[PDB]
């Protein structure tokens, strides 16, 4: 079994001068994501919102408007720095949902113990014709 | 949040795309949530009632505005020297010179001069007074209210008809041909004979006295004894004057053909005879199919029997009855194709065979009517092909259409598309090459080096009609021939007088420029058909996207993978073909307008030696006839043509605003909107208010549609302004 | 190569010396065409007893400013 | 421009933006032209004439055609 | 926030970390003087309801139509003034 | 007179157009000296114009209302009235030459398709092979008809890709 | 002979009646 | 395009022209000041009035410009 890591709120943030591409009004009333990673030295990386930031030694904490920004930062950390990280979904009511490394290992590597949903056992051309599903509220591929 | 109640998927969208797609998917009832086929067809039937009520209200409004603010009384007495008045103008933006410049046809204040031809039509059908027009408007108001009540009534479950009633094809065709087509035509014959024929001869016939006036002095007895020739005794003479009893007659069903010498229009007795024959034939046609009386046809079995042996058509028409009957999109495509072709026929016939009294003297009315019906026909034909593509996407079943002609034509669709491509490529190559060669030899000072291919085939068919101008002496152009001798006491004298006269539009004399522009029209039709047919046949799938039928009729793309998949849906093919339709109808109406501008000035030469090269088209037509248009307002003042100058620049603006959505695509705009959302979300004194719906860029399909709509609106407004200004300001 | 071509056309196929005598009335021209398909009509009556395309590039004014006043120097 | 179009088309030339109605004068540009025209003998003591005739002064005519004349802004 | 150093996230204080701030809004009871506040709340008393503030727009549209009825002509306006002869046209028309 | 058209040998407007062109060129002449290079160029242009008009009158072209030659694009209507050179003979000529070019390109495609690298042979053209096939394409109609009768010109539909309908 | 005031007013009232019919049909179609 | 349109109209209307020892006769005659504030003025007094030279250029030395005027539209 695998347990998700807790979001340690009192985690230091990278050195940054302040951008205009950061959080907006969506964070207060819908959602804002957050990414946490461990860096082995003080070095400069690129923000998903524009500009350069310096992440510090040890834990680094960065909140972002969208999950795609968090994954862009994570993939640039993994490629240009060989640094893994954790992404969390933080609701404004207080509940925090763990996100990307959901079962510990990365999704491109098998784990034996995942849900194989949305996997049809037919070919592309074996879907139903749209006339046979007429007036149903579903596309032919989700039958 | 719950505005698109027909689509809960759209209602959950927290952006402006929710309302944008809620407006545009309102009439796609088949895609609505919880929609059965019974409720579908009942909604269709009630919306049909609403549309009929709308049409009847629109024509009642035309009648009321002509009766209330028009000059119908003054136009009846002097049809050739009175400008018809559409409606009065009440615009508080007018300055004093605008108020003077728009006071024209003897009215008290500013009015619009009608170009719709309602004056000529109403004068021809026997309407003489404003009281009659008001009575017609009131009657149409009442009947539109009745149709609205019927639309409400049939939505009530006690009066909702069954789905099988909607699909009862044999009965619906029987009643439409016999009653909707035949009985209506017979009643129009009754109106023409009872009212229009005496009102054409100065004898007033109304509801107060039509039961005491005799349409023919030998009443009904020649009809019932079979002596029907007594209804064609003395026709109206060549010296007859419309609306007067001078040299009139008693015959109600003449057959002379040609045109009335004074009105330059068809004989009304010819129309009554035509409508009576049409009524008889359509009632007979409506007695064809089987209903409940044990006689008639089962059209399914007729389709079953239409299978030639040796497998020439595969299974023939196996199961096409159910294919047409089950698919509303197949029926709509057939109906739109036929209605668009009929609209083209109406345009091609009313200019050359003017039906209404004192038509073809009003040059603006003829041109406006022709161009209107041509554009309507082109739009409706594009809709027919689009709905055929929808039927392939939605209602096409390969199992029940296995081996029949639909499956056959889908099997070798590559041959059809490739041969349409070859024909369009040939036409474009050759017509453009001839035009550019003519331009170059004109520029170099050598007009004698032009390639001027004589349209010998169309001239030969003109000679087969009796046009003795090319010296063929073929069929009707030789009096000794059997067709010429067969009807020489029938339609031949009037038709020959019309065909041999250069004062009308009955088959105009044609030359090499007509040949070149006809090949231009052929190229336009071929390429538009290529785009539409390719979109229909590739709607279910292609090599780039085999599973296109699962994605629906309209969708943006398939992403930048596989080299790029921009504009891959059948909706996008319709979208591309609308431009080609607009270009083709532009060529058609440019040809018509320039030819008739040469005719009406008496200078057929300007078109004859200026249409063979494109600089003549640009200079002697576009540049020359726009001089009075662009001087509608100027620093020296303004006149009545100012409204068409403003509409000219308006259409140019809308056309380029269309180009805005056409060229730029969704991505620059989304970033810009995000930046402006950042600006507003943290601008002081404006953070008090916030958007209920998140501002987003228009979707790819939506903005394609918006750019196409602006393109078409600017196209139509610009050409309507130019045509009406260049004809009304000159004649 | 482009500059050499412009100077060669000013030397050989131009009315530069004639234009120098009467710059007010003679239209500058530095390109002539071969009479092949009726295109010799493009050779304008620019003046100076010369026929050619009227140029709008201003090489004649530049050469006069530099003080050429000779065909051999171009 | 659209307001000017609408007022001309409505027969209201007094309501459009023009020199004869609602004026919109380039006062900064006109004053800059005046400063350039008055520059010689004042802020350009060694200049015998202005840099260009576009600022102001007499019309320069060569061979019966205007070489350069003052440009007025409205 | 708990931003005593570089910690800009806190689940126990999630209000400040998200970015919800007043920017310039400040709480203060003192602003408008006496009697005039009562004067203005009496001026806008029953009108505060949505139906009556709709009825104000209704009487505004009634004024819009009253301009057209009697008000456009009171400021002259060319659309209701008289006319001065007419023009014939290109050919013999009217 | 095949369609209400008059021959340009006897049509007055053809002579009027020729006279107008020659008069315009003479107006251009009346500005230079007699032996200048522009004078020789204008004299050559005049000679070309008169030769062209006389040739058009000689060849038997049809002129319409004014003096512009018109071409007939109907076999039979042009054959029995002697205007097959208007459209029919150039139709045969284009069909022959276009078939020559297309057959040469086709045979190059089928010759390089059965090589080691057909991809390289279409950007790097084997010039001797292209020259040989261009020469062989002059007998394109007989070769094409022979390959059509043999059945080797067209491909069976079962070996050609289509979309899944 | 142009139509009178009473004819225009009666026509406008009948148009109001058919507008009531129209909104009834529209409400029935929405349901 | 707008910049060069303004340039050509402004100097054909207020700069370029002929002198007659009593005034300056401009190419278009001072029409910029009363027509360049209106889009219909740009379309008519500049874009239609000055276009008559390129469309009636067939049969002359400017026939190449006339041909290119249509080819560029194409
Ligand atoms: C004899 C009986 C009869 C009659 C008179 C009608 C009549 C009509 N039906 Mg109906 N129907 C019938 C029986 C009948 N039906 C039966 C038995 C069934 C059950 C099987 C149905 C089922 C049915 C359905 C489901 C629907 C209709 C609809 C309609 C309307 C068609 C739309 C329209 O008005 O366009 C008018 C058509 C014409 C005028 C024909 C003109 C021909 C061409 C197009 C024009 C050329 C004419 C001429 C040149 C134009 C000149 C005029 C110009 C001067 C202005 C129409 C009034 C539709 C509707 O609108 O719903 C209310 C529809 O949805 N019917
Ligand atoms: C549907 C159109 C229509 C209508 C409503 C009328 C109505 C009328 N006509 Mg008329 N008529 C018509 C068409 C029509 N006609 C046509 C097409 C022609 C030939 C061009 C004539 C020629 C004509 C003449 C010469 C005369 C009339 C006369 C009359 C009036 C006396 C009634 C009558 O004729 O005696 C009664 C008729 C019958 C007993 C026979 C009718 C039975 C028929 C053969 C079968 C019914 C089937 C038919 C399709 C039903 C249609 C229903 C439709 C009304 C909805 C009457 C108001 C007479 C008159 O005095 O004028 C005031 C007169 O002299 N008509
Ligand atoms: C009898 C005629 C008829 C009928 C009943 C239908 C019915 C239908 N069509 Mg169709 N169509 C028609 C003709 C018709 N069409 C014609 C003539 C064309 C060619 C223009 C098309 C092209 C077409 C396309 C491409 C599509 C449909 C679709 C549909 C379906 C949904 C309609 C919709 O999208 O919601 C409502 C439609 C609208 C609200 C139209 C939008 C408004 C237009 C574009 C703007 C008009 C602006 C106006 C002119 C501005 C005035 C100018 C002035 C200010 C200067 C529906 C079943 C869609 C579909 O099947 O879904 C998959 C589809 O995508 N139609
Ligand atoms: C003539 C067609 C046309 C028009 C009107 C516009 C208009 C506009 N473009 Mg655009 N564009 C066009 C063609 C056009 N473009 C084409 C063909 C392309 C493809 C290359 C582009 C590509 C493009 C880009 C990439 C961008 C724009 C941008 C803009 C906006 C700039 C803001 C502005 O000008 O302020 C004012 C608005 C106007 C002058 C438009 C006319 C408004 C009139 C004059 C006044 C409004 C009164 C109104 C009519 C009254 C309401 C009546 C009521 C009944 C509705 C503007 C609305 C830029 C933008 O997003 O904003 C900065 C942007 O970046 N365009
Ligand atoms: C920007 C460079 C440029 C351009 C655009 C031109 C353009 C032109 N030149 Mg020119 N030329 C140039 C540079 C250029 N030249 C230079 C640098 C020289 C000095 C060596 C010349 C010397 C030259 C001569 C002597 C002539 C031209 C001529 C011409 C005209 C006809 C060309 C032609 O069809 O020949 C033929 C096209 C071929 C494909 C054959 C090329 C074979 C040559 C001999 C091989 C040279 C390598 C043409 C408008 C002719 C002319 O003005 O007509 C009266 C002419 O006689 N040029
Ligand atoms: C491309 C299609 C085409 C078209 C539209 C025409 C049209 C025409 N041809 Mg023609 N023809 C064609 C192809 C075509 N041809 C071809 C390919 C050949 C070569 C075999 C001929 C050989 C030919 C001859 C020999 C004659 C015509 C003639 C005619 C004219 C009279 C035909 C007639 O009497 O009535 C229609 C005939 C039917 C059988 C129907 C007519 C305008 C005749 C003519 O010259 O007119 C005076 C004539 O004698 N044609
Ligand atoms: C010699 C090669 C060749 C051959 C034999 C063909 C043959 C054909 N083409 Mg095709 N085509 C070619 C090259 C060729 N094409 C090229 C290079 C292009 C890209 C521009 C196209 C683009 C094209 C399109 C878009 C279409 C065709 C179509 C067709 C068919 C209709 C007849 C036609 O001439 O259409 C016209 C052909 C053209 C407009 C292209 C001609 C280009 C040149 C002249 C050919 C190449 C010459 C070649 C380099 C010579 C090599 C010599 C060799 C010794 C090395 C036909 C079977 C049509 C079709 O599908 O019909 C059903 C069609 O829609 N072609
Ligand atoms: C054509 C359609 C015309 C429709 C007109 C509707 C108008 C709205 C309406 O009736 O509201 C009904 C309410 C009554 O509410 C009710 O008024 C009741 C009192 S009584 O019932 O009116 O006596 C009260 O008890 C209750 O609380 C209150 O809700 O009336 C008002 O309160 C309106 C008062 C508006 C006062 C200010 C007007 C504008 C000031 C201009 C300042 C500058 C002047 C220069
Ligand atoms: C086919 C039979 C047609 C012959 C009709 C003869 C008519 C008069 C004879 C006549 O008109 O003159 C000869 C005529 C063409 O000659 P022309 O009239 O053009 O000669 C005059 C000019 O060419 C010289 O200035 O030849 C033909 O008839 C058609 C040529 C056969 C087509 C060859 C194609 C073979 C495939
Ligand atoms: C897409 C699609 C569709 C649609 C299609 C279309 C659109 C079609 C069309 C088309 C058309 C639009 C057509 C037209 C037509 C017509 C015709 C085809 C005709 C004919 C005939 C004849 C043969 C004639 C003859 C004659 C003449 C010539 C004249 C005089 C008289 C006579 C008789 C002699 C559908 C839905 C279906 C299906 C699906 C897909
Ligand atoms: C301008 C633009 C936008 C921006 C979208 C805008 C500016 C839409 C905002 C328009 C406002 C709402 C004014 C529209 C005025 C209309 C006349 C109102 C019509 C409303 C109907 C209900 C009648 C895109 O999103 C886009 C996407 C893809 C290709 C091209 C483009 C594009 O050109």
PDB file of N, CA and C in Angstrom, chain E residues 67 71-78:
ATOM      1  N   UNK E  67     -41.108  62.182 -25.153  1.00  0.00           N
ATOM      2  CA  UNK E  67     -40.314  62.996 -26.070  1.00  0.00           C
ATOM      3  C   UNK E  67     -40.814  62.843 -27.501  1.00  0.00           C
ATOM      4  N   UNK E  71     -42.284  66.593 -27.643  1.00  0.00           N
ATOM      5  CA  UNK E  71     -40.975  66.921 -27.117  1.00  0.00           C
ATOM      6  C   UNK E  71     -39.942  66.994 -28.220  1.00  0.00           C
ATOM      7  N   UNK E  72     -40.084  66.119 -29.218  1.00  0.00           N
ATOM      8  CA  UNK E  72     -39.247  66.209 -30.408  1.00  0.00           C
ATOM      9  C   UNK E  72     -39.545  67.478 -31.193  1.00  0.00           C
ATOM     10  N   UNK E  73     -40.825  67.836 -31.315  1.00  0.00           N
ATOM     11  CA  UNK E  73     -41.206  69.036 -32.050  1.00  0.00           C
ATOM     12  C   UNK E  73     -40.916  70.309 -31.266  1.00  0.00           C
ATOM     13  N   UNK E  74     -40.910  70.233 -29.933  1.00  0.00           N
ATOM     14  CA  UNK E  74     -40.627  71.408 -29.115  1.00  0.00           C
ATOM     15  C   UNK E  74     -39.190  71.887 -29.267  1.00  0.00           C
ATOM     16  N   UNK E  75     -38.277  71.009 -29.675  1.00  0.00           N
ATOM     17  CA  UNK E  75     -36.905  71.395 -29.984  1.00  0.00           C
ATOM     18  C   UNK E  75     -36.725  71.382 -31.494  1.00  0.00           C
ATOM     19  N   UNK E  76     -37.792  71.747 -32.215  1.00  0.00           N
ATOM     20  CA  UNK E  76     -37.861  71.691 -33.672  1.00  0.00           C
ATOM     21  C   UNK E  76     -37.624  70.267 -34.157  1.00  0.00           C
ATOM     22  N   UNK E  77     -36.370  69.948 -34.514  1.00  0.00           N
ATOM     23  CA  UNK E  77     -35.891  68.690 -35.093  1.00  0.00           C
ATOM     24  C   UNK E  77     -36.425  68.525 -36.512  1.00  0.00           C
ATOM     25  N   UNK E  78     -35.548  68.251 -37.482  1.00  0.00           N
ATOM     26  CA  UNK E  78     -35.982  68.226 -38.890  1.00  0.00           C
ATOM     27  C   UNK E  78     -36.975  67.127 -39.232  1.00  0.00           C
TER      28      UNK E  78
END
